[PDB]
Amino acid sequence: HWGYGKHNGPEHWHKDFPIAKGERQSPVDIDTHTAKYDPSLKPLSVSYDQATSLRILNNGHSFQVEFDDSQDKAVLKGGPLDGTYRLLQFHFHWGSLDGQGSEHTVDKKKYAAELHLVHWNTKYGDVGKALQQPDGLAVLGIFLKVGSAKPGLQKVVDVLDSIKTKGKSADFTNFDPRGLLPESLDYWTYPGSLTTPPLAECVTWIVLKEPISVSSEQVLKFRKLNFNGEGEPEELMVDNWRPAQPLKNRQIKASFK
Ligand SMILES: COC(=O)c1cc(S(N)(=O)=O)c(SC2CCCCC2)cc1Cl
Ligand SMILES: [Zn+2]
């Protein structure tokens, strides 16, 4: 029963998940002037050469490209991380209009959408155990702006009409997430949480500075998805983003400048 509407949206989540008002919630606004360059941070290692996408899916909140995470194929390491984090799935957050949609903001700027590639720390064995640890998950976040198309996104947009509705999936083998990355791996990082219930405070966030471009047609296909199942009053899947939360006692670190 939680979602993105007036009566079940982000302002209400704390009734079922009191950690919504915790000390390390996400997303946040990234004030770029205040983030400090940390010369001790390592370049991100994004090793996606052997990624096995299995499936794409309409979870009723967003859609997700899943991966086989039963072996170290697609992994994230370095940057702020200790150890190895296996890619589980990616999904997006986006707006009803191009001036909203991202979860993180940059100097209060909202982007049209935000891609999250979710990884879990292999030291904990499985994602359910990683959710219970302060360093269980690492989420790589990538902003999307509307301008030219992103050719590596097209295979995802073209299947969305087959998952219009919540609980639909389809094969999605051989999708290469390297196609969704911007040129630069410069990033901000801070300790936070899931941005959806249960809002567990288990995430090291790594937010890339460089957005990717997607076309207006591509994002229009995201906005044709539905939050409902096959069979209820139709409500378009838009504005499935949590606003920025209090930074509290946290420092955002920059990998550059
Ligand atoms: C609209 O947002 C979502 O649909 C969503 C958003 C998140 S986020 N923003 O990463 O907190 C997760 S993370 C989830 C992935 C499966 C393993 C446990 C954590 C999964 C989902 Cl499925
Ligand atoms: Zn997300």
Numbering used by the authors: 4 to 260
Question: Which text from the study accompanies this structure?
Answer:
The carbonic anhydrase (CA) family (CA, EC 4.2.1.1), consisting of twelve catalytically active human isozymes, performs the catalysis of reversible hydration of CO2 into bicarbonate and acid protons. Since it has been observed that CAIX isozyme is highly overexpressed in numerous cancers, it has been postulated that compounds inhibiting CAIX may possess the anticancer activity and may be used in tumor treatment. Here we have designed a series of compounds, methyl 5-sulfamoyl-benzoates, which bear a primary sulfonamide group, a well-known marker of CA inhibitors, and determined their affinities for all twelve CA isozymes. Eight crystal structures of CA complexes with compounds are presented in this study: 9a bound to CAI and CAII, 3b, 3d, 5b, and 9a bound to CAXII, 3b bound to CAIX and mimic-CAIX (mutant of CAII containing amino acids in the active site as in CAIX: A65S, N67Q, I91L, F130V, V134L, and L203A).
Mimic-CAIX is CAII with multiple point mutations that replace the side chains of the active site of CAII with the corresponding residues of CAIX. It has been shown that six-point mutations (A65S, N67Q, I91L, F130V, V134L, and L203A) are sufficient to switch the binding mode of the selective ligand (mutations slightly different A65S, N67Q, E69T, I91L, F131V, K170E, and L204A). The mutations introduced in CAII mimicked the active site of CAIX. The ligand positions were similar except for the shift of the ortho cyclooctyl group. Nevertheless, the native CAIX bound 3b 10-fold more strongly than the mimic-CAIX. The crystal structure could not answer this question with certainty, but the differences in binding affinities between CAIX and CAII were even greater: ΔGintr = −56.7 kJ/mol to CAII, ΔGintr = −67.4 kJ/mol to mimic-CAIX and ΔGintr = −75.0 kJ/mol to CAIX.
